[PDB]
Design a binder for this molecule. Structure first.
Ligand code: NAP
Ligand code: CL
Ligand code: CL
Lengths: 355, 351
């Protein structure tokens, strides 16, 4: 194993030469030998980023491909062979994965105690991970996941977690992919706050609904936004006091409905968890003056948010959703254990149980 | 005056019929009749964004033509008369306009007090501004300016300011262009904070250096980051206690040098104002734990920031720098009037 390993894994970077793995366009996908403080994982399953999966899927369809599950599998193997990593070349987003530890480097900065063989989750993005895909066993088009056989590198700077034993690996894969959303909502929402959750039926949305109502309290107000009337009971069961039916791209409808529901006061906090483009301005226009707009979505464009707010004279704080926060995996899992409505939904949507 | 006017400009949106003036491709430029909540202005000069004027030029050179200034005019007439606005259809950008108020709507949400015939600067992009161009008088290459004889609409949600009576027109516009940056930094910097300003030598950077030192005060520490050793005196003159020499795209150098100047404590606040790509992680890696990173540059990539920080286990807050903040014009003009060193550099650079 090579000796002088950058904990950020600059030694894997190929192009351009002076940037770190995530902004890098091409990384080193050679698992023949690892560096001194890397880590090798035999990859079970990829959870591609929802904003990315949705963009690739719509790309393959516009390209006219016949068997999406095959077209997607080819899309993965091709891009990972050419770039070294599954980073979407149009959105910049990645995803995460679960696997079994193959090789711990001599100087790997062991955080959580894991030995060779343990089954862990890479909570850092696929947008920075050197990944080799040998075969794609299965594409799950409606769950953003891919069973594969392959290997990936964890740098000593990366975030990882030994899988909980109380849940199945696929439910754990799903909750951990968005564990940063409820952790951040816990910090943003104060008692008596009005919170608007745009994309409230989604995977991170239903966790944010619940945490938002816990934090805002009996006299706070949680408002979900969805475009399918069938989602309304789930949004209310997971925390929403009110639900607006609107396209997340519809700024004028969302602003009028939030205004009506709040006597013109609008929202202290807006949480954006959709996976499509052009929802920046609708998110901004739901916020009270000097309110907080937290963009968790990887379909967010920095330019549409910045110029969207400025163009209409909105002075609101606009945050870039950080998928990492300290203890987020513990905080997310604790939310599931405390909330059985949420645990039931997650198992039904993302786990593979029997009866 | 047409009633039921939308403060956001939707009533002047033609294509697509579901989004706001900014992302829309087609706008209505009929200045024959304005809405009750609008302001008609007589545009004197069009100040196209550098990257847009450095695209209409580098496209017309290919098809030949003549003069280049004579071809930019033709392009703008066609774009504004068809699209309804001067938003580039490739870079998606547009600068600002100066001119004189011609009509004030009855129910218009007046911000700064102006009258008919006052000379205003628009603080929203041309990318959302209904614009009609009757004739171009001159096209100022390399300065990105366009004298015209046209009119433009500001919506009740627009932002504008009257030109100062006590500062050069070009000096004031140059500072109005970046006024959102020092206004927002004075909210983020607390007393005794370590602040790192990446791009400390630029136009918005020296404004941020000064605000950062004022707010952080005698026992705080302001650290500039520049690529060129000739920039150190300017940074110090405008507030940096220290300057780091490094390429903005070099996270590992910047991180080691900030650890050096701070005994490994790093920055409570990192301010990024370089207009160059791949500077997200270099900005993040200068922050201490649970520190704040402010991205003001349009070169920022949302996913590079979000997935940069999460990818390395950095629990820092990251903010999209708004080009607008309440009273930002007055806040930046007052910063210039209070700070003579800053004022002199500005007049020397942009007047
Ligand atoms: N910051 C990070 O590190 C990080 C990590 C993971 C995820 N993310 C981002 O967070 C977002 C949510 O992730 P997720 O796993 O929760 O995704 P998800 O399960 O697919 O949820 C997306 C939700 O958005 C809704 N939606 C999308 N477009 C809409 C529109 N135009 N109008 C109304 N609703 C719309 C969808 O409802 P429909 O059924 O109506 O489409 C769905 O409920 C994604 O953008 C993802 O990229 C970021
Ligand atoms: Cl612009
Ligand atoms: Cl404090």
């Amino acid at each position: 194993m090579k000796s002088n390993g950058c904990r950020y894994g600059t030694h894997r970077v190929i192009e351009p030469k002076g940037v770190l793995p995530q902004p890098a366009k091409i990384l080193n996908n050679d698992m023949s030998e690892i560096w001194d403080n890397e880590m090798l994982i035999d990859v079970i399953r990829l959870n591609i980023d929802s904003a990315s999966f949705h963009q690739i899927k719509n790309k393959l369809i516009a390209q006219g491909h016949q068997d999406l599950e095959k077209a997607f599998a080819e899309h993965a193997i091709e891009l990972t062979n050419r770039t070294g990593k599954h980073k979407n070349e149009d959105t910049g987003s990645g995803g995460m994965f679960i696997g079994r530890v193959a090789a711990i480097g001599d100087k790997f900065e062991m955080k959580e105690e894991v030995k060779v063989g343990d089954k862990i989750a890479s909570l850092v993005s696929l947008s920075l991970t050197p990944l080799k895909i040998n075969k794609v066993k299965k594409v799950l088009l409606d769950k953003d996941q891919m069973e594969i056989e392959g290997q990936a590198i964890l740098f000593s700077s990366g975030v990882y977690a030994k899988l909980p034993d109380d849940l199945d690996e696929n439910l754990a894969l799903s909750v951990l992919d968005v564990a940063g959303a409820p952790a951040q909502v816990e910090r943003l929402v104060k008692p008596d706050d009005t919170v608007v959750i745009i994309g409230a039926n989604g995977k991170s949305g239903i966790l944010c609904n619940a945490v938002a109502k816990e934090r805002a309290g009996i006299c706070g107000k949680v408002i979900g936004v969805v475009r399918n009337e069938n989602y309304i009971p789930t949004c209310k069961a997971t925390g929403c006091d009110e639900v607006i039916l609107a396209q997340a791209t519809d700024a004028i409808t969302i602003q009028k409905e939030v205004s009506r529901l709040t006597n013109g006061k609008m929202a202290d906090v807006v949480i954006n968890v959709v996976n499509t483009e052009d929802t920046e301005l609708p998110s901004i226009m739901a916020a009270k003056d000097r309110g907080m707009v937290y963009f968790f979505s990887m379909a967010t464009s920095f330019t549409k948010a910045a110029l969207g707010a400025g163009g209409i004279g909105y002075d609101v704080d606009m945050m870039i959703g950080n998928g990492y926060a300290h203890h987020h995996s513990e905080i997310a899992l604790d939310l599931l254990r405390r909330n059985s409505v949420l645990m039931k939904i997650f198992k039904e949507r993302y786990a593979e149980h029997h009866h």
